[PDB]
Amino acid sequence: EFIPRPVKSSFREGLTVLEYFINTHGARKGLADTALRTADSGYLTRRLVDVSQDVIVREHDCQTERGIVVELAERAPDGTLIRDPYIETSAYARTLGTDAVDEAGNVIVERGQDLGDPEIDALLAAGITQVKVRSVLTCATSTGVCATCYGRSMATGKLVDIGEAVGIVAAQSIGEPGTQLTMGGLPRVQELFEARVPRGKAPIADVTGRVRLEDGERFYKITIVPDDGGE
Amino acid sequence: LRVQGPREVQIHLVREVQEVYRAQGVSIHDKHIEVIVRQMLRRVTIIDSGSTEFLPGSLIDRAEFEAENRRVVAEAAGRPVLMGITKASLATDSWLSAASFQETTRVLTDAAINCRSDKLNGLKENVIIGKLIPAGTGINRYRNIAVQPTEEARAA
Amino acid sequence: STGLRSAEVEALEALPDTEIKEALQALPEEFRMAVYYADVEGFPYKEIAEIMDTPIGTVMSRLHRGRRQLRGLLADVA
Amino acid sequence: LDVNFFDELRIGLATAEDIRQWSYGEVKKPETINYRTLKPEKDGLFCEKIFGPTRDWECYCGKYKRVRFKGIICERCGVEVTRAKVRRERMGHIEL
Amino acid sequence: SSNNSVPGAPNRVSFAKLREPLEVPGLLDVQTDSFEWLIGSPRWRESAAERGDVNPVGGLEEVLYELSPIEDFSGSMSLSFSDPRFDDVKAPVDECKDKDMTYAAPLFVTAEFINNNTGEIKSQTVFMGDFPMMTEKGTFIINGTERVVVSQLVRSPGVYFDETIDKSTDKTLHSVKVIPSRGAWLEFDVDKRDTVGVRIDRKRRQPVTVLLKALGWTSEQIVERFGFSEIMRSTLEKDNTVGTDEALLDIYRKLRPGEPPTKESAQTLLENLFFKEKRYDLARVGRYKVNKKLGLHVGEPITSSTLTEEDVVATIEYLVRLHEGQTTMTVPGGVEVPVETDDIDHFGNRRLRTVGELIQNQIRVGMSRMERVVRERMTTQDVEAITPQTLINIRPVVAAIKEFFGTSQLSQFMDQNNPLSGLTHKRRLSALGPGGLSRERAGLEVRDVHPSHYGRMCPIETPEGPNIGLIGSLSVYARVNPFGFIETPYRKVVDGVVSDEIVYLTADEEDRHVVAQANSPIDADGRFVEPRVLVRRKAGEVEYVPSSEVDYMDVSPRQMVSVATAMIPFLEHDDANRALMGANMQRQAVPLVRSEAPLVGTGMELRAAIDAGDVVVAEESGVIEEVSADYITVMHDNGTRRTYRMRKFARSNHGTCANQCPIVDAGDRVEAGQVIADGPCTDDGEMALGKNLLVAIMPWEGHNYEDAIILSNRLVEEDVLTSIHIEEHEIDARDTKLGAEEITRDIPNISDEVLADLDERGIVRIGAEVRDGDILVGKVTPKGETELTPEERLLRAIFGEKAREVRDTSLKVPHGESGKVIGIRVFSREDEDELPAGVNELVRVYVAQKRKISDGDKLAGRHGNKGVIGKILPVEDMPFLADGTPVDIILNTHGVPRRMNIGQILETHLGWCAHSGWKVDAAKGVPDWAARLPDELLEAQPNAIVSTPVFDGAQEAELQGLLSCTLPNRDGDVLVDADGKAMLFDGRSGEPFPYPVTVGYMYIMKLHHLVDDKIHARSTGPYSMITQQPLGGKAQFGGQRFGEMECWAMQAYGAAYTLQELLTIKSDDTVGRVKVYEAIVKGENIPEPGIPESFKVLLKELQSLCLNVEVLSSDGAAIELREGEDEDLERAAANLGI
Amino acid sequence: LKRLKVVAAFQQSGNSPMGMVLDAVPVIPPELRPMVQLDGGRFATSDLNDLYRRVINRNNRLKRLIDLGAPEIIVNNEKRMLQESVDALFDNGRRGRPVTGPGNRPLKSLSDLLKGKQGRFRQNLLGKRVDYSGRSVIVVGPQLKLHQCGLPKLMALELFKPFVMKRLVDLNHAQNIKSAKRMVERQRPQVWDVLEEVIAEHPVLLNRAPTLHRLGIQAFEPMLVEGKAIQLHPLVCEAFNADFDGDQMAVHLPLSAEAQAEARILMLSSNNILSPASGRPLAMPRLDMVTGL
RNA sequence: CACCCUCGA
DNA sequence: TGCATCCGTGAGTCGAGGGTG
DNA sequence: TTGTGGGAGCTGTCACGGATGCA
Ligand SMILES: [Mg+2]
Ligand SMILES: [Zn+2]
Ligand SMILES: [Zn+2]
C-alpha cells in the first residue's frame, strides 16, 4: 500500500528520522522482490529454452501461401492516418506473402521482400493500412521452420541463415528482460505460457446470435439465441 | 481454441504476451513469441483411435498423426490441443532430454516401462553425448564441405 | 599413491627418457633384449631363455655383460 | 575406441538375469576396508576379487605384481591382474 | 563537541545541535553480560543484585538445579550437584592461538551422593571438563582459530494466534499454537467445517472435546464454559465418543500407530506429555508470555510453570471468542485480557538467544546424556563401592560442547578484515539456525523491516545476498532483557517536562506508551516549545499529539542505527540501498601501513575503535615508565606496575595485518581508560578505515567510465593505499603405507641453485624472498614400488642402489603469490608436541606482501559509491589546481546523481572546508545561517577534525556559508569558490578545463577485493577423480565452469565445434585432453574429440537403478565402451628401443 | 485409459512386469562411491556405501533368521526392514521419513545423483568445468578498438602455456620440451617476447554471468596489457550488462581451427553490433559519450 | 567426497 | 462414484574465503 | 543376559496439477 503520511523532504535537505525509517521498508522490500523476480525469470527462460530447442531453420522456403495479417496503420475521419505503434515488433523484419494491392494496379511490394524501413514508409505513403506477411506460425515445414517464413535475422539484418537455431535465440530474447516486469505481470506471462485456466475467466461467445442479459443479485445470466437454429 | 481454431489462439496468445511486455515497455519482436507458441500446438488429441495404434486421449504429433493416417488409409479423430511449455517439453521424443530437463525420476520410470529408444538427434542430446550439435556449423551441408584450390591457382 | 594428474603431466610422462634410451641403443640388440626381458619386465632366467630360444648359459652371460656395459655407460645418479 | 557415431540409445527394466550377467561377483559382508593395512576386505563393498585390483597389475596377496602376468587370475586370492581403471566399470550384486 | 568522557581523545568539534543525555553503552556487553550470567561471575552477581533482581541464578547453577537430584527407580539413592567452580585458565590466548588449542578453564562441581537405605552421605569434587572461555574481546578460541557466537532470533515460547483466510470459502479461520521452550507442541485449529481440532505432536486432528474429557472435564462441565460458542457445541454433536477414560484411550490410540491401547498407559502418557516438568517445560519467558497473554495470574508466581489445565481451557476459550472478536475477555479468574491475533515478527514475540543461552542449551543435552549413564551405573554397581566420581561420566558433556563450538551455525569464523567488521560481527543477530527457522521457510515477510525494530535492530545494515533480512546488527543504545527481549532507553516525560531519568523498555512496554522524537524543540527548563509534538503510536502510527500526552522521548537521534551505519556522514542524504552498501563496505576495508582519521566524520569512530578491542587501553591511571616497539610499561600511583604487549605484524583470519604502535612517550601521565597504542585501523583513538583524498568530480577520457576510478600515481609512490597481507602455509611429514616421510633438504633431481634459500633442515630461511614455484619446506615421501617406471626399474636393477628411495612431495609457493618470509613455526614428534595420528612433523611458514594500490583494486567511500581502478596516471597527467596541487582521485559525474547518494558531495564540500580551514566573518555579529548551530565552529584551522552526527550535524545552509569562509592557501589565493568548484588545468595538453569542476576532500577506503587475489588462469591441472572434470576453485588451480546458460549462448551462436571442444576435449575426454596437449606441443592439428567420461558415469549410475541402458550401433548392435589394452605399450616399447 | 497406458507397454516384446520386483540388487562400482582418508585416521562416508551396508546387514540377518527357524513375526519384520532399506538405497525419503546420518542429514540416495540442479544431468552433463580458462576483474581501457581486449600477462602466459612451450622449443631458448615447461614455470624473461607472438591473431572468448542472451559471450583479439585486470571495451558493456563496480569476467581459449574460426566469424565483438531481440543497436555510445556528443 | 557459514557481481 | 484432499513437483548464474564429518 | 523403563525434533514458503482416498 501507500502510507497516508508521505516523505515530504528531499534527499538534498536530508530526510528526517521517521522518513528514513519508512523509506527503508520499501527499499528492502524492493531488494527482496528483485531477488525473487530474477529467479522466476531464470526458471521461465530455462523452460522456454527447453521447449524451443528443436526449432532451427532447416530449409530456404516453406513455399506456403498462408500468412498473418499485420495492421500497418489506422486512419481518423480526416485524411491523416495514425501510425500503428506495433510496426517495429509486428510488421518490421517480416516477409510478405501477398503483395500490397494499394487500391490501384500499383503493386508496392514483391512477394518475399525484406520489409525494411523504406518498404514500410512506401507502404504507408501509398495508403495501404493492412498487409499479409509470412509467419512462423503458419509454416508447413516438416522439421523446424523455413528461412523465408521466419524473416530476417535481427542481428545480421539479412535473411536468416540455415544453421541458425532460432528457438534458443527466441527463448533468450523473451527471457532476458524478464527481471524488468513488475506488478498482470510476470505471473501473467507464466500463466499464459503454461496454458493455465486463468484466475479471472471471462468467457467468449460460442456462436453468432442475439444476446440476452439477465441481471440478478451478484450473479448475471447471459443467454445467446443462435442463428443456426440450434439450442 | 475449441471455438475459433488454432490460427486464432496463436494470435491471441502472442497479442497478450506482447501486451504485457509492452505494458512494461520492452521491445520484443513478435517472431520470438511466435516461435515459442508454434511448439504449443504441435500435437493433437485422439478421440477415436480408428485403425491406428494411437491410444485415445494421448497427445501425438500432428505430422506423425497425418503420416500414420496415410499408412493406414493405404491399407482417426484428431483435435488440435494447446498445452503448456512444461508439458510440451516433457512430451518430447527423446527420453534423455526429458530426463535432463525436469522430473527425472518419473521420466526415467516411464521410459524404462515403455523401453524407449532415444534417436539421439537433438541439441541437448548431442551436448550430453559429446557429439556435434545439429545446428550451425554442425549441419551436414556445412560440416562436410570439401575444400581444394582451383587449377588456375594450383598452377601458380 | 598417485596424485592428481593433469593432461600436461600425462603427456610429458609418455615421452622417452632420451638418456637411458641412448644407453639402451648403444648396447647390441642381444644384450638389449636380454636386459629388457630380465630387469625391465622381470622374467626368470629360464623363461627368458625360452623366449629367446637359446640355452641358459648365453642368456645369463649376455645379461651380465650387458649389465656391466650399461653400468659403465650410464654413470648418472641424480 | 569410440567415434561418437552411433544410431540410438535404449533403456528398459533390467531383469535379475541381466543383473547377474553384469555383476562380476556378489558382496557378502558390510565391511569396507581393513583399517590397519588400508586394504579392501574380501567379499566386501570394496573387495578386489569382485570389483578389481586397486593398484595396477597387483593382486591382493602380493603374488603377481608386474605387467608380465596379465589377464591371468591369482589362484590364492582370486584377484584379476589388470589395470585398476576397471574399478569404475565392474559392478557387483546382492542376492536377496 | 569535546566529548571528554574518554581521556586523551582527539578534539573533534561537532556540529551537534542537541546534547547527549545518555552515553553509548558497552558495545560488547551483548556477549560479555550473557557469558558472565552463564558463569556466575561476581560482575554479573553485583549487576543482577543491583539492577533489582534478588534471585541470582547462573546458567550452570540453573542446569544443576534442574538436574538435581538424580533419583533411581527404587528411590534408594540420590545424586545432587552444587557449586559450579572454575579453575584458572589452562593457557593464555596467544599461546592457544599458537598451539591450536582452545582457550578453556576446568569446571568443578560439588557432587553429593546420599544413600537413604543405609543413610550415608558422600560429598566430593568432580571434574566436569574443559569449559571454553570467552576472551576479553568477547570472542572464543577453538582449535587455534578465533570465533564468535552470533545471537539467534527465535520466537519466544508461549501461545500464538493467527488469522488465515479460507482456501475456498474465504471464511476467516483462526488458528493457535502453544510452543514450549522444550517439549511437545500443542496446536488448535478451526476447519472449513465448524470443527475445532487439537493437533498434538502433529498427529491427525481430533475433536477438542476428546482432550477436554481426557483431562477429566465431564460433559455437563465442558458444555458450560463453551456454551456461548456454538462451534464447540456443533463439534460435540459431531464427536465420536463421550467420556473420560474412553477419550483417554482414544488419545493413546491416536498418538501411537500400530499399538494395542490401554487406559493406564494412556493416563500416564498424557500426564507425562504436557504436565510433567521432566519431559515438558515452559520456560520463565514462556510462563510470563502466557500469563500476560491470558491474564491468568497477575501476582507473578514463577513456580508451577508447566501447562496448567486452566491455561488450556483459557486458550480454547480465547480461540472460540477470537472467532467472534470481543475485545474484553475474562476466563474464570482472568483479568480483562484483549482478544487479537499475534504478530510473529514483533520483537515482543520474537526474542533472541545470546551465547550464554546457546551454551546452556547444549550443556543441558550433555548433562541429560550424562544422567542416563548415571542411572545405568546406579543399578549395575555394588553399593558402598560407588563414589560420586564413578557415577559421573563427563564424556557426553565434552562431546556436546565440542560439537556446539565446532559445527553449530551460530559459532562462526570471526570477521577480521578490520576492527569494525569484528565489532559488528559480535553484535550481529541471525534468524537461521537450529531451534529457529530454516532457510527454505524464510519468506519475504520475516525479512522486511518491522516497526518494532526501531531502536533495537538497525534496518540499514543487512547483506545484499540471499541472507538479506535474515542478518541484522543490534542498535547502538539497545540491550538484551534477561528474558531475551531487546530493550531500548527513553527519557521519561512528566506533564510535558522531559527529565534526565532513562527507562529501558521492551517492544511490549513501548506500544503501551507514546514515544516522542529526539529533535523536538526543548527549552532550557526541559519542556516542549511547540504545542504539538510528532510521536509514534502503538501499531507504529505517526501522529501529532499535544505535549501533555507525551510519555517517553527518544534519548538521541541515530537510536535506530547500528555502529557501522552511524559512521556515514550525511546519512539522511543517502537512499537506503547505497547507505546499506556503505555500511557493508566499511567492514571490508583493509588496514593500511599508516592510519589516517577521517577529516569529516561522526562521533562514533572514537568509541567504536576503543570498544572494538584492537586498541590498547589503560586499565588504571599512572605515568608511563617505559615505551618500546614491543610493549608499554606503566607505573600506577599506588606503586604497582602494568605492561601491555604489542601485537606486531599479526595475521588476521582473512589475511589482513593486525599491527599495533604506541601513541605515548616516556613520562606521560595517562588516565584510566586512555588509548595508549593504536591498532590496525585506528588513528590516535578513532576508527581510521581509509584515507582523505583530493577528489575532482568530472568525466576524464573514459577511464572513469561506468564506475571506474582514476587514481594519482602519488598514492603509489607515497604508499598511502599500500597494505600488508600475511599468509600462512603449512606442511606435515607423516606416515604412509610404504614407510615414513622426512622433512629434509636432500631432494632428488634438484639443483643447488634452487635450494639456495633453504637451511640445513630444508626449510626456507627467514627473510628470504620467494616467488611462484619456489620451495618453502623440503619433504620426501617413500615411493610406491608399483609406480616405478621401466627406466627407474632398469636403473635400480643395474646399479642396485636400493637405499633411501623417495619422491618429491615438497611444499611450493602457489601461483600468483610472493613476498618476504616473516616467521617459521615448527613442531616435531621427536620433541613432545601434540600432533594427530601418524603425523611426525609440522611446519608453518608465514609470508607477507606489501601490496600497493593497483588496477582493478576496489575502492569505495562511506556512501555506497564503489569502484575499481581503471587507470593510474602519472602525477603530471592528473588535473591540478591553480597553485599546481594535483588531485588524487577522479570520480565520474554520471555516477553520482542516479544512485541517490548526495552525501558524498556534501562530504566533499565539508572535507575541503576542513582541509583549508575557515573563519566566519565576525564583523557585525554572527550571520543568520551561522546563528543556529555553530558555536565553536565559527573558525577552524587547516586540517581540522570535525564530526557531523547523523540526523544532526551540518545543515545545507551552514555548509553553503562555510564554502565562503574558506581560508586562502599559503599564497593568499582562495582556490575553491562558494559553489565548491575550482578551475583545473589539464595536465596533458596544458589548456585549463573550460568549466569549473567540483573539487574537495573525500574519505576513500581500500576494500578487500584486489586483483592479486582474484586473477586466475588454468591451461591444465588436476581433475576430480569421480567425474574426471576439471576441479573448481582458484585455490585448487581449477577451471572455469561453462554452465548451462553458456551452452545456450554457444548454441544460439551456432558455434558447434566450440561447444564440442569445451565439453569433450577440455573437460571429460581422458584420452583426448592428453592428445590435445601432445598435438599443440608438436604443432599439429587438434584431433577429433571422443566420449565424455561423465556420460559413462551416468550410464553406470543408471545401471545401478536396475535400468538396462545400452548404446546401440547403426542397427541394433551392442557397442562396448572400453579402453583398448595395448594402445599404450607400443609407444613405450618404441621409446625404450625395442 | 490411464491403466491401458501402463499395460500396453508391458504387452510388447517380452518386457515382463517381473522386473518391477527384484531378486538381486546391483552394486555400483566402488570408484563411483569413493572413500577418502581424513586426519587422525578418520574416513569419509559416502552415503551410498552406508545404504548398501544397511541392505547387506539386513539381508544377512534375514538369512540367519530363515536358517534358525525364527517366529514368522520376526522374519516378517526383517523382510519389511530389508524392503525399506532397499527403498532407501534406491530413493530415500520417497516413502516415509528419510534415513538420517551424522546430524540427521538425509543420506544421498541413488536417485539424488540424478535429480535436482546439482545432479548428474544439469551439473556434470549439460555444463562442465573446462581447461584453458581463467577469470579476472575487468577495467575499462577506452583506448582499444571494438574487436580488442586487454589480457594480463600472467593470464595469457598460463592460457597459452603449451603454445609458448612449443614456440620456445622452436627457437633454441629451450633444448627439450620438459626444459621448456620448466622455463615457462620459472617465468624466465625469454618467454614474454615469445608470448606476444603466439597471441597474435588468436581470439579469446569473454563471458560474464549471468549469460542472459548469446551476447553474454563474445570473441575478442587479446592485447597484452600490464597488470592483473582484463581491459574491456566500453561499448560492449550494454551487451554484458557489465559495470566496473567490481565485476569479474572469464576468458576461454579456443584451440581447434574450427573453434577459432567460429570465434573470429560468429562470435567476434565487432560483428555483433545489433541486439538479436529487437535489432536495436547495442554498441551505440551509452552514457558518457552521449553527453560528450 | 559430502554438508554448512560468510561474502562479491 | 464425485469431488475435496493430499502429495509430489518446481522455484537464477558465476565466483571467493573459511569449517567439520 | 530378571524388581523401572517409549525419540528428537520441529510448519515460520508459495503455486499448481493430478492421482488418492473417502463419504
Ligand atoms: Mg556490477
Ligand atoms: Zn514456412
Ligand atoms: Zn594374489
Side-chain angles (χ1 to χ4, degrees), chain E residues 876-904:
Chain E
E876 51 272 19
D877 294 55
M878 208 65 45
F880 53 101
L881 290 166
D883 59 332
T885 293
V887 300
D888 290 326
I889 178 176
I890 314 178
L891 301 187
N892 194 311
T893 298
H894 294 82
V896 185
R898 63 173 169 181
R899 323 288 184 178
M900 290 303 304
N901 41 65
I902 202 61
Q904 59 179 305

Coordinates of all heavy atoms in Angstrom, one line a residue, chain E residues 876-904:
Chain E
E876 N 51.7 14.2 -13.4 CA 51.6 15.3 -14.3 C 50.4 15.2 -15.1 O 49.7 16.3 -15.4 CB 52.9 15.4 -15.2 CG 53.3 14.1 -15.9 CD 54.2 13.2 -15.0 OE1 54.2 13.4 -13.8 OE2 54.8 12.3 -15.6
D877 N 50.0 14.0 -15.6 CA 48.8 13.9 -16.4 C 47.5 14.2 -15.5 O 46.5 14.6 -16.1 CB 48.6 12.5 -16.9 CG 49.7 12.1 -17.9 OD1 50.9 12.3 -17.6 OD2 49.3 11.7 -19.0
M878 N 47.6 14.2 -14.2 CA 46.5 14.5 -13.4 C 46.1 16.0 -13.4 O 47.0 16.8 -13.4 CB 46.8 14.1 -11.9 CG 45.6 13.7 -11.1 SD 44.8 12.2 -11.7 CE 46.3 11.2 -12.0
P879 N 44.8 16.3 -13.6 CA 44.4 17.7 -13.5 C 44.8 18.3 -12.1 O 44.6 17.6 -11.1 CB 42.9 17.6 -13.7 CG 42.5 16.2 -13.3 CD 43.7 15.4 -13.7
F880 N 45.3 19.5 -12.2 CA 45.8 20.2 -10.9 C 45.1 21.5 -10.7 O 44.6 22.1 -11.7 CB 47.3 20.3 -11.0 CG 47.8 21.0 -12.2 CD1 48.1 22.4 -12.2 CD2 47.9 20.3 -13.4 CE1 48.6 23.0 -13.3 CE2 48.4 21.0 -14.6 CZ 48.8 22.3 -14.5
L881 N 45.1 22.0 -9.5 CA 44.5 23.2 -9.1 C 45.4 24.4 -9.7 O 46.4 24.2 -10.4 CB 44.3 23.3 -7.6 CG 43.2 22.4 -7.0 CD1 43.4 22.4 -5.5 CD2 41.9 22.9 -7.4
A882 N 45.0 25.6 -9.3 CA 45.7 26.8 -9.8 C 47.1 26.8 -9.3 O 48.0 27.2 -10.1 CB 44.9 28.0 -9.3
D883 N 47.4 26.5 -8.1 CA 48.7 26.5 -7.5 C 49.5 25.3 -7.8 O 50.6 25.1 -7.2 CB 48.6 26.8 -6.0 CG 47.8 25.7 -5.3 OD1 46.9 25.1 -5.9 OD2 48.1 25.4 -4.1
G884 N 49.1 24.4 -8.7 CA 49.8 23.2 -9.1 C 49.6 22.0 -8.2 O 50.3 21.0 -8.4
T885 N 48.7 22.0 -7.3 CA 48.3 20.8 -6.5 C 47.5 19.9 -7.3 O 46.3 20.2 -7.6 CB 47.6 21.3 -5.2 OG1 48.5 22.0 -4.4 CG2 47.1 20.0 -4.4
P886 N 48.0 18.7 -7.7 CA 47.2 17.8 -8.5 C 46.2 17.1 -7.6 O 46.4 16.9 -6.4 CB 48.2 16.8 -9.0 CG 49.6 17.4 -8.7 CD 49.4 18.2 -7.4
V887 N 45.0 16.7 -8.2 CA 44.1 15.9 -7.5 C 44.6 14.5 -7.3 O 45.5 14.1 -8.0 CB 42.7 16.0 -8.2 CG1 42.2 17.4 -8.3 CG2 42.8 15.4 -9.6
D888 N 44.0 13.8 -6.4 CA 44.4 12.4 -6.1 C 43.5 11.4 -6.7 O 44.0 10.3 -7.1 CB 44.4 12.2 -4.6 CG 45.6 13.0 -3.9 OD1 46.6 13.1 -4.6 OD2 45.4 13.4 -2.8
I889 N 42.2 11.6 -6.9 CA 41.3 10.7 -7.4 C 40.2 11.4 -8.2 O 39.8 12.5 -7.8 CB 40.7 9.8 -6.3 CG1 39.6 8.8 -6.8 CG2 40.1 10.7 -5.2 CD1 39.1 7.9 -5.7
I890 N 39.8 10.9 -9.3 CA 38.8 11.5 -10.2 C 37.6 10.6 -10.3 O 37.7 9.5 -10.9 CB 39.4 11.8 -11.6 CG1 40.8 12.4 -11.5 CG2 38.5 12.7 -12.4 CD1 41.5 12.6 -12.8
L891 N 36.5 11.0 -9.8 CA 35.2 10.3 -9.8 C 34.3 10.8 -10.8 O 34.1 12.1 -10.9 CB 34.6 10.3 -8.4 CG 35.4 9.8 -7.2 CD1 34.6 9.7 -6.0 CD2 35.9 8.4 -7.6
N892 N 33.8 10.0 -11.7 CA 32.9 10.4 -12.8 C 31.6 11.0 -12.3 O 31.1 10.7 -11.2 CB 32.6 9.2 -13.7 CG 32.1 9.7 -15.1 OD1 31.2 10.5 -15.1 ND2 32.6 9.2 -16.1
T893 N 31.1 12.0 -13.1 CA 29.9 12.7 -12.7 C 28.7 11.8 -12.8 O 27.8 11.8 -12.0 CB 29.8 14.0 -13.5 OG1 30.9 14.8 -13.2 CG2 28.5 14.7 -13.1
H894 N 28.6 11.1 -14.0 CA 27.3 10.4 -14.3 C 26.9 9.4 -13.2 O 25.7 9.0 -13.1 CB 27.5 9.6 -15.6 CG 27.7 10.5 -16.8 ND1 28.9 11.1 -17.1 CD2 26.8 10.9 -17.7 CE1 28.7 11.8 -18.2 NE2 27.4 11.7 -18.6
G895 N 27.9 9.0 -12.3 CA 27.5 8.0 -11.3 C 26.7 8.7 -10.2 O 25.7 8.1 -9.7
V896 N 27.1 9.9 -9.8 CA 26.6 10.5 -8.5 C 25.1 10.6 -8.5 O 24.4 10.1 -7.6 CB 27.2 11.8 -8.3 CG1 26.8 12.4 -6.9 CG2 28.8 11.7 -8.4
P897 N 24.4 11.3 -9.5 CA 23.0 11.7 -9.2 C 22.0 10.6 -9.3 O 21.0 10.6 -8.7 CB 22.7 12.8 -10.3 CG 24.1 13.1 -10.9 CD 24.9 11.8 -10.8
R898 N 22.3 9.5 -10.1 CA 21.3 8.4 -10.3 C 21.3 7.4 -9.2 O 20.4 6.6 -9.0 CB 21.6 7.7 -11.6 CG 22.9 7.0 -11.7 CD 23.0 6.2 -13.0 NE 24.4 5.8 -13.2 CZ 24.8 5.1 -14.3 NH1 23.9 4.7 -15.2 NH2 26.0 4.7 -14.4
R899 N 22.4 7.4 -8.3 CA 22.4 6.4 -7.2 C 21.7 6.9 -6.0 O 21.4 6.2 -5.1 CB 23.8 6.1 -6.8 CG 24.8 5.9 -8.0 CD 24.6 4.7 -8.8 NE 25.7 4.6 -9.8 CZ 25.8 3.6 -10.7 NH1 24.9 2.6 -10.7 NH2 26.8 3.6 -11.6
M900 N 21.4 8.3 -5.9 CA 20.8 8.9 -4.8 C 21.7 8.8 -3.5 O 21.2 8.5 -2.4 CB 19.4 8.3 -4.5 CG 18.4 8.7 -5.5 SD 18.2 10.5 -5.7 CE 17.8 10.9 -4.0
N901 N 23.0 9.0 -3.7 CA 23.9 9.3 -2.6 C 24.5 10.7 -2.8 O 25.6 10.8 -3.3 CB 25.0 8.2 -2.4 CG 25.5 7.7 -3.7 OD1 26.2 8.5 -4.5 ND2 25.3 6.4 -4.0
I902 N 23.8 11.7 -2.4 CA 24.3 13.0 -2.5 C 25.2 13.4 -1.3 O 25.9 14.4 -1.3 CB 23.2 14.1 -2.6 CG1 23.7 15.4 -3.2 CG2 22.5 14.3 -1.3 CD1 24.2 15.2 -4.6
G903 N 25.2 12.5 -0.3 CA 26.0 12.7 0.9 C 27.5 12.7 0.5 O 28.3 13.3 1.3
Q904 N 27.9 12.1 -0.6 CA 29.3 12.2 -1.0 C 29.7 13.6 -1.4 O 30.8 14.1 -1.1 CB 29.6 11.2 -2.1 CG 28.8 11.3 -3.4 CD 29.2 10.3 -4.4 OE1 30.3 10.2 -4.8 NE2 28.2 9.6 -4.9

